Ligand binder design. Structure first.
Ligand SMILES: [Mn+2]
Ligand SMILES: [Mn+2]
Ligand SMILES: [Mn+2]
Ligand SMILES: [Mn+2]
Ligand SMILES: [Mn+2]
Ligand SMILES: [Mn+2]
Lengths: 314, 314, 314
């Protein structure tokens, strides 16, 4: 199978600059070369150049709508392109608003895909419910079929078509949900595993259940959108919105190893790595290294070890 | 339901001055304001002023017996008062000896209550078994019916009436038990989950079993006495007796979330926060913050989120 | 029962100097004295003085083969001696290559022993598969009967006799396995619990299965070879090969308590503690304290507490 890396050095979805440096830091850490060591064919598409929309006035509370909408339209085009050729798309953020383009493009080719969202947040604030006009906290609102017409059309997003329903998404790691968002997920009946279900069940059973929920009836492509703040700040401190009490490095790797085993991974997002938010160089290195480890894990790297087939090492 | 915060700025139960500042630090961190945002009606009763007993000579090894006994008599009077009017009492320590008064007063109104003690310690040393005369390590000895007359009467504690039996208490988090205390818990058949049972069972099953043990036959009010050293020093470093290998921030929140769900929480103690023991201001901040988080969780704050009823956020 | 402490201040099994200081650091922390407080009789045999083999030319890739072979021949003699007298041998490393003599010696007396190997690494590289000629990463290759004749004879190891088979060893904590080693364990059918099985099952069920696997049929002497890097670097940072995502302090203690409860502990190795690799004095203190705690745990110290039998504490 083929892997295509696409860097989305974008940050207008939130107020903290620096996430645009994310793809660079990940490449600098040897992400691409380490992936070539796996059984996959790797092709680096490079970073996308995002044109800045001048005079991008905020829409009500929503900041940089046009700049975010345009960058996402462009990303969706690139992703649909790679997906069409039958390759696996790996997007390196950038803030989480880029999931709009990533998932949209992916869904054009695989309309029946399901999404596993790993994040401390639901990121499902609608333009009417946000306390800040920050779009990184609103991706899922733009993708749900059930949220269509429940919020005014935003400048720059008219190309978007709600591709997935409430039945096709599962959240893992939740621990910082606004009252509005919580209202939404309860009302829509969206399956989730907050830190409390993880604590109650253990990560092993959490994965068993998300799989029987999403793949029980039909086997379909999986899109894993991974916000690095889903792990505890001790492992991924260099992020914009760290929340204590998160998934451990072990649980994170467990998630990715189980996904790899399904043989159904189709799209992957490694989002919110912000190299400029590390208090010490080691905090940055810690964050990058774990992002890299999770990516490699999605593609076969096992903790029990790996050996090349047909090679008699004796 | 109504909540009433009662501060017990007392420290004579142990040698390290500082726990008296506990209530102030917790209020300073916005505990009361954040509690008002919940569905509960909150009333801050202020801090109790304890009269110092001059010439408080030690009773054998037992230090400050009269000061501790008197402060507890006054606290018991206050708690019995609030409980009577049908409100939930929340005591902010202060060292753990104040549990004598908090639980005594609570039992005057709800004689059939049960106690869930979260601590790294059993705090069940009798005046005869203590290696130090410190009363913060002896609360439970004074409250147990099965321990009546097994130790000489102490000056200042004649008002105390053993209110709960060995069948009504469950310990969680044990990892530092003296040989004597160990002998007592084994002999009396007290249900406990030391760190090894937590490790073996997982916090989810630990809670399931404590509830089936304490509420299996009769549903009765619950008194949760929470010693902050029950959690690992990594989370609550600002305490007088930190012991490595404790409960995680996650397990602590899981305990409080499950207790909230029973609908039976009647009394709560947040003990042993000592602001002066932090090696760095961040250490004190870390400690206070988690204490606040545990309190809020007892009253409904969930990690999956919360939304006000009847409010259509769309 | 009797315990005999044997110090193995040896470091030629790997490139980083400092592990020889391991035994001194452990003794300085009061290990021997703390052991005497347990129900066991303790005899400290002191530290073995290892004769350095001049002109120890590498065997192909393999470094210091003769020095390592000789130090291990001498250690095996000592251990066979103490085991013969019916005492429990406790070896203080020193690098993990010393497990060759430690297990060899033990097996001469107890041929039916089983081995529980706690380590991040399988340490099963053969002289032909090592990327570095370091012998600390090859102990098990020399002990396995199934690996006899699969690699050339090494200068200094002619005295070694493969004592255990693939059926007698269980690995716990694996998270850094070379391709070659992974091929070997998979081919030979060796039972193991990598961090992913630990995540999936929980330390409790992991221990239940290693016991039914090794002792289900015949109860036999247990040799526990413990490499301190088996625990996460947060607990044991002063080692030569730290790998993130390891066993916690709590899981490590759980392992030792369960082993203690079997009543079959016969031999114990506490390897890889390197004092000179701590970045701050505290890091060395943290490493030493947890190694001491694990040792005392094997010999009865429980987290729920201990009380001396026949002493009425009331
Ligand atoms: Mn996100
Ligand atoms: Mn997030
Ligand atoms: Mn206490
Ligand atoms: Mn305590
Ligand atoms: Mn190792
Ligand atoms: Mn080793």
């Amino acid at each position: 199978k083929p892997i295509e890396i696409i860097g989305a050095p974008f940050s207008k979805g939130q107020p903290r600059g620096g996430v645009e440096k994310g793809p660079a830091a990940l490449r600098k850490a040897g992400l691409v070369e380490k992936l070539k060591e796996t059984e996959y064919n790797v092709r680096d598409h490079g970073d996308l150049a995002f044109v800045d929309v001048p005079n991008d006035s905020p829409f009500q509370i929503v900041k940089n709508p046009r700049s975010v909408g345009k960058a996402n339209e462009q990303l969706a085009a690139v992703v649909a392109e790679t997906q069409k050729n039958g390759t696996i798309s790996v997007v390196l953020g950038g803030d989480h608003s880029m999931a709009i383009g990533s998932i949209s493009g992916h869904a054009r080719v695989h309309p029946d895909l399901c999404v596993i969202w790993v994040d401390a947040h639901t990121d499902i604030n609608t333009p009417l419910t946000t306390s800040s006009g920050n779009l990184h906290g609103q991706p899922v609102a733009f993708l749900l079929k059930e949220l269509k017409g429940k919020f005014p059309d935003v400048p720059g997003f008219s190309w978007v078509t709600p591709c997935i329903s409430a039945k096709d998404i599962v959240y893992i790691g939740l621990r910082d949900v606004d009252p509005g968002e919580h209202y939404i997920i309860k009302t829509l009946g969206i399956k989730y595993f907050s830190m409390t279900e993880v604590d109650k069940l253990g990560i092993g059973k959490v994965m068993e259940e998300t799989f029987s929920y999403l793949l029980g009836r039909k086997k379909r492509p999986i899109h894993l959108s991974f916000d690095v703040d889903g792990l505890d700040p001790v492992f991924t401190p260099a992020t914009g919105t760290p929340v204590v009490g998160g998934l451990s490095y072990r649980e994170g790797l467990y998630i990715t190893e189980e996904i790899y085993k399904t043989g159904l991974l189709s799209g992957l997002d490694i989002m919110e790595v912000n190299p400029t938010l590390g208090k010490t160089p080691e905090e940055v290195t810690r964050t990058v290294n774990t992002a890299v480890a999770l990516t490699l894990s999605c593609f076969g790297t096992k903790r029990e070890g790996n050996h090349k087939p047909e090679t008699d090492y004796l």
